[PDB]
Amino acid sequence: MRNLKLFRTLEFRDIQGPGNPQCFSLRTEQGTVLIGSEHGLIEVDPVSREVKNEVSLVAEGFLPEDGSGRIVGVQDLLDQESVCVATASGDVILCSLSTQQLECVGSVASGISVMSWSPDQELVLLATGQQTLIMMTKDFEPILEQQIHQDDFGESKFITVESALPWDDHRPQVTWRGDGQFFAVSVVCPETGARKVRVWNREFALQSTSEPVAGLGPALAWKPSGSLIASTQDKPNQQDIVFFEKNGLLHGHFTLPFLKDEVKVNDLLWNADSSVLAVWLEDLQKTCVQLWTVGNYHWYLKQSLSFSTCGKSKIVSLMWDPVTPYRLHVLCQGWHYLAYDWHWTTDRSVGDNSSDLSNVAVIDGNRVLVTVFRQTVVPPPMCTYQLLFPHPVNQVTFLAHPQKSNDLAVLDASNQISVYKCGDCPSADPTVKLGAVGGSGFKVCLRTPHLEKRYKIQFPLKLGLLTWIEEDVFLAVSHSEFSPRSVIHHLTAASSEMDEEHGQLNVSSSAAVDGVIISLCCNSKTKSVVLQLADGQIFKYLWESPSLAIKPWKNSGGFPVRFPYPCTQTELAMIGEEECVLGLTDRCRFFINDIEVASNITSFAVYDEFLLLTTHSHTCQCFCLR
Amino acid sequence: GHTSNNIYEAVKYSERSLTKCIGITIETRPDYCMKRHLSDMLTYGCTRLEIGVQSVYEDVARDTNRGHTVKAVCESFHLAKDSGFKVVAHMMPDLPNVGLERDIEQFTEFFENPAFRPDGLKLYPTLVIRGTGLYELWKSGRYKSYSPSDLVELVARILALVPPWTRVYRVQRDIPMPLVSSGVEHGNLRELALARMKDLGIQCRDVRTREVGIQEIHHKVRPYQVELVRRDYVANGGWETFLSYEDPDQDILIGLLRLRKCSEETFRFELGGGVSIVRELHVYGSVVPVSSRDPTKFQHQGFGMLLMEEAERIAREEHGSGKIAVISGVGTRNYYRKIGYRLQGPYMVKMLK
RNA sequence: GGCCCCAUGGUGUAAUGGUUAGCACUCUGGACUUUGAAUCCAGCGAUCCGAGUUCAAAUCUCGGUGGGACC
């Protein structure tokens, strides 16, 4: 059980590509990005914000000079450093940006319906305009061609003793398996007027066929680890997501948090981990995108964020990073590009051990589940008690005050701040409900929280991570695409001169520093705040800051401590008298004040006296840190 | 040894007998799982049940002409667990229209899903035998088995997946050899799986393979430092809870307990409100006569007392209930009498205030 | 009375001047929460005794032990 937290983002607008984007690919090693435009190809590195190469098949002649065709597909290739390209007219071409070696490598007497590349870059597979499929070797040598609408359930058979949606595009879709051994097609059935799916092996033998199901959608996505193929279906009162096996039978599903016939949906994207999944929704007469998660066969909508459909801000496309499973790229029609990153966390709370209750909070949907562990232990799902909310929350945090670390803060999607205090409230607001602890006659004598405040902001994610240093002081971080830097903020408490459940917190100050502040933490006992820069530089910032007090973290010799890597998290400790720092990376590498100490660590924790670790070698151990 | 006239007379007489019977278990199928039959079995002192699942895919049932739905199995599990019995499932690898990957996926599902999370497990590989339709199906050369190596790998992978609380009871059938058209040569398979999992260097955590008796009789390892361990999960809507004493360094186990909170929906009104049921309790080892105290060994050192008091404390505080009920064998009731437990219906019970 | 012959697992036996006596019947254990007995697997059994020789001896010598046919 964990919850994702946004780590860092990268936004890039104002790309001068001719015409408009059509598609794009990514240059993994090069660190740049491809662009499919109406006139030619463009390559640019994001952090550079500089174009490297330009071409125009309009200038060459293949692309309609007036501009009428589109690039069906662009796919980066690393062996030859030359990128293949597909034409709406049905022309496959190869070129290299190094010297502009554009030259037609083949064509068909139809348009290229779609271009597919084997996950191992071994093979290619394309669809024609005359409803047939063309398989070819690595170098465009035609392997075979076969008609799409044959009549069989597939080679894999069984032994034993109403119409397409109005908003359907009728565009066929295909996908690979995660092993490069099976691929599934999702052509709309011309005969039944519905959607149909078939699956074939690496040999290109017709393995299996889908089953008659009403309300089928056009979307499709194979799970990277296999055995699961995603699809969407609308039922008389609800839009749901269903799954399929390699046998091509329905198995498992989960519903959506929206009403009946409200919004349009696009296809589904898997992260590199095969764990996280992302869904694209279109506001049907305000699009959105959501990050779901399955846990113990329960589906958790861990994240979501929306956007406006106004043309330039209307999104063009997006893509998972095929290297880091928690990295995303996206681009919108205002010739703009953007990048996003996340990392895991648990969201625990620590205060005075006598008074603290070892409470733990988890986020799901428009609600938060809380479990107090000083007295109770419940196995997720379920929880001690839950708090409801109108629309989905994004991230939460506990109060950082000692002997008080039992009240948290909630950040809803629409810039709403919810305060819940566990004081001796006589009457409980209806938002608080009890989980497994409640029942018919079962009774407990714990202390419950209550709603306190619903604040707003007083001047798409205008702010980054949220921290609650003290009852009245919150902190966040911004960015800047030009001249990369971050800004701290000082959202103090505005007094209650309105509905006492309201009040807009305003920026007392905006502390600005250069570079990307990837992380930050603080200690209540020391009342000190220290951040980690993207460089691994460690900088204590005086949260008091009578005048912008900044100081890089000092070693025992009074010199800077520059972490050799970007930490996945940060921590303060009280070793002997030293206020040393703690951190680690995803690579099990552990360092202390720029001293590596171990490489088998998978997790750690400390509650004011002891450091506990989880070796990758299946062991734990404690230490008296004083 | 006393001639009787009805069930109840025999029950009352066996109460005071010295053979000290501790329970019975019966097989069944989900059709006969309504609360009427459960109440009937409550009158017999039965403890555990057999169902026969054979799959996790509904289509297979009609393919196998089973004649019911997997759903009914699921509600039978939920209802029986709410009542307080134990359940052992039957798994049926290498079935028609089932790939090897299908078997792996379904077996993983069998524990990944909170729907099932069963307690007792039994496995029986497919065996084509003359007389059945499958006999002709294979005879027509249309139903094929695996090679023995495939079965060994399948079993070895499966054993790596069993959750610690689940206990395996048997592997393979006991059918005479010169009758099966696809019977494996080896009457012994657990050993072959053990060899294979040594080859792969991955270990299993079954209860039967970590109790003191088997571990000593097969490896001669003496426990040295035994401590407590607590775990919990969710199954059929229940808040299950598992307690044990065991020595972790050798991973050898001595005593166990299974206790949960009753579901909001129940059949026995005696459990209505402030009630937590303890499904079962047991310490492994060997038989020690009730009068005898210490042949060294580990069966009368007062271990059960600590588990009872701690489970009671948990139910009083964490469950927040108000009265503890428990099922028991006919003789075992007297045991609970020593702790101040009194009878009510077929259930032993103690007030919690 | 001597000549010969023999002495290996509990029994029936191979083997032989050198790092390990191999089988066979038998017995024992696990698979097995359906089985002492079944099916498989695994395991425990040994050169008559004392003197010699030989680097080295069950195999070469002598003596003894006990047993087996000879006039």
Ligand SMILES: CCNC(=O)CCNC(=O)[C@H](O)C(C)(C)COP(=O)(O)OP(=O)(O)OC[C@H]1O[C@@H](n2cnc3c(N)ncnc32)[C@H](O)[C@@H]1OP(=O)(O)O
């Ligand atoms: C519920 C049906 N299932 C079972 O019964 C499983 C088999 N049960 C057992 O083997 C044992 O009862 C246990 C698993 C509880 C292990 O016994 P445990 O070590 O916990 O007993 P304790 O050491 O705590 O207490 C000892 C007392 O239990 C008594 N006792 C043992 N068996 C029984 C029994 N069937 N019925 C009543 N009292 C018993 C002993 O006579 C002893 O009394 P003592 O003062 O004269 O010595």
Ligand SMILES: C[C@H]1O[C@@H](n2cnc3c(N)ncnc32)[C@H](O)[C@@H]1O
């Ligand atoms: C006792 C369990 O074994 C199954 N079962 C019973 N007889 C056979 C057989 N010949 N082959 C396979 N499974 C069998 C039952 O259906 C039940 O699940």
Ligand code: MET
């Ligand atoms: C002996 S077969 C298993 C028990 C029962 N006959 C059933 O199939 O449900």
